[PDB]
Amino acid sequence: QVQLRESGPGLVKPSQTLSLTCTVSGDSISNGGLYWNWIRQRPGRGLEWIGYIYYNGVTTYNPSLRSRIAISLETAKNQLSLRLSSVSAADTAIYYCAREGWVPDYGGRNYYLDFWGQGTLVTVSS
Amino acid sequence: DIQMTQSPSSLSASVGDRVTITCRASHNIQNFLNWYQQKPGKAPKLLIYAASTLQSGVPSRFSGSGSRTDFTLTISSLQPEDFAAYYCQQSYGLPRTFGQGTRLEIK
Amino acid sequence: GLCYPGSFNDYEELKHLLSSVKHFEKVKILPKDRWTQHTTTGGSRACAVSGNPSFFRNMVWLTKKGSNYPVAKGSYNNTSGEQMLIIWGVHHPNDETEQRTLYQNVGTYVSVGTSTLNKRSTPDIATRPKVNGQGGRMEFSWTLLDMWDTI
Amino acid sequence: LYQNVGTYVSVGTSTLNKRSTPDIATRPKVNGQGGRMEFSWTLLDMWDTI
Amino acid sequence: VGKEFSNLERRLENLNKKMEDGFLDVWTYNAELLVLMENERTLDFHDSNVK
Ligand SMILES: *[C@@H]1O[C@H](CO)[C@@H](O[C@@H]2O[C@H](CO)[C@@H](O)[C@H](O)[C@H]2NC(C)=O)[C@H](O)[C@H]1NC(C)=O
């Protein structure tokens, strides 16, 4: 039932802002009480977590991007977005959005990513 | 934050063989390890969550177990279809991290 | 168990640790042939095999060589690929006479450490009841040396 | 009280092995005394010698 | 509720954890069992009252 779809500019020039939008379908973004995540893969390299937003505006980020990243959501459209400033060659990657579910456990809620979108490629070049 | 070391970097095994891939955490991640299967061209699929529970729809040939700082992914009866990079995810803290990815080739 | 009368510190704690171990790879860390300044061939009747005095097979009882006991030193950087279990101990003679014929030095100590371990022990030289024919005791201790750490 | 200063007390059995030394130091007075006395105990098993 | 233990207190840490997990299982069991037993009786209660 739950699907995540993504879109964006495709091409970003160096020193510009990268902006991607994920549309959530079949899962109300504001009611589930789940966390929404951004993840990416640079060529060659493995999965890197970017950050997440709660159903409300509480947002956390991967500290390596603390000077460059912002995440937000629009409840009205069931959409998530990612914004990265000062984009460079290192930011070329397949970007993915994902839903974070959980298992109640002995140590507290045990989180995992079940639904992933197809993702999209962003190329940074001159 | 908590770093994840995944090993082997790559595997090669025949159809019908059983293999293992392991995760080692730099800290105690208390049963909060998830395993993912990434086939080329696709977003990673969840196989195992909370160390040993299979995700619905995951073939019974997949299993795993572990405890603080050390977990294992076991894949028995490997089929031609089980070609993927496998990844270690640590859900214990907020700045969630992943291991390097093990590349398993099937013969 | 202990062929040479003794004690093992945090023994119950080690046995607990072993409930999380399925396999050990025994690794030579400090080959006994490196102790060029010490006798590495000692032993006792209590551990004897077929009448020949002997000792524990994975450990080196370091005693005086010639007329002295140079400070014994050694270390290991744990490049084995995983956390390692290291066991060592301290001899406790039942008389000053025994301390002197084994080590020359009497006011001795054993000092061991890692990035997290910091211990210093001294021998207790005293009369005790005989166990397995010996009035002496040997005390064992252990630590886990973490990865890339040095003991 | 003892003449000797660098003293020790050594006690043992087939299972007990302890050595203690005195701690000579200024402490607050309790019951009029600035001194302290430390007690220890062991169970001596049957036919064992302390 | 939370307690910290040193690396030489694994036996005690495990005892503490087992205790807490044990009580969680007992109370989770009691909470779920009570809800299920009561829901069965609640529905029987209502059908009984209409009858
Ligand atoms: C113990 O071995 C490790 C591995 O060779 C040494 O650590 C490396 O030190 C160099 C600098 O000389 C770094 O560039 C490497 O990244 C380090 N590797 C690792 C895995 O940390 C370590 O220095 C050695 N030991 C001691 C006690 O000095």
From TrEMBL, chain D:
UniProt PTM: Palmitoylated.
Compartmental location: Host apical cell membrane; Virion membrane
UniProt subunit comment: Homotrimer of disulfide-linked HA1-HA2.
Family: Belongs to the influenza viruses hemagglutinin family.
Function: Binds to sialic acid-containing receptors on the cell surface, bringing about the attachment of the virus particle to the cell. This attachment induces virion internalization of about two third of the virus particles through clathrin-dependent endocytosis and about one third through a clathrin- and caveolin-independent pathway. Plays a major role in the determination of host range restriction and virulence. Class I viral fusion protein. Binds to sialic acid-containing receptors on the cell surface, bringing about the attachment of the virus particle to the cell. This attachment induces virion internalization either through clathrin-dependent endocytosis or through clathrin- and caveolin-independent pathway. Plays a major role in the determination of host range restriction and virulence. Class I viral fusion protein. Responsible for penetration of the virus into the cell cytoplasm by mediating the fusion of the membrane of the endocytosed virus particle with the endosomal membrane.
Entry protein name: Hemagglutinin
Taxonomic source organism: Influenza A virus (strain A/Singapore/1/1957 H2N2)
Gene: HA
Automatic annotation (TrEMBL), chain E:
PTM notes: Palmitoylated. In natural infection, inactive HA is matured into HA1 and HA2 outside the cell by one or more trypsin-like, arginine-specific endoprotease secreted by the bronchial epithelial cells. One identified protease that may be involved in this process is secreted in lungs by club cells.
Coiled-coil spans in chain: 1-25
Compartments it resides in: Host apical cell membrane; Virion membrane
Superkingdom, natural source: Viruses
Subunit structure: Homotrimer of disulfide-linked HA1-HA2.
Function: Binds to sialic acid-containing receptors on the cell surface, bringing about the attachment of the virus particle to the cell. This attachment induces virion internalization of about two third of the virus particles through clathrin-dependent endocytosis and about one third through a clathrin- and caveolin-independent pathway. Plays a major role in the determination of host range restriction and virulence. Class I viral fusion protein.
Family membership noted in the UniProt record: Belongs to the influenza viruses hemagglutinin family.
Listed name of the protein: Hemagglutinin
Classification lineage: Viruses, Riboviria, Orthornavirae, Negarnaviricota, Polyploviricotina
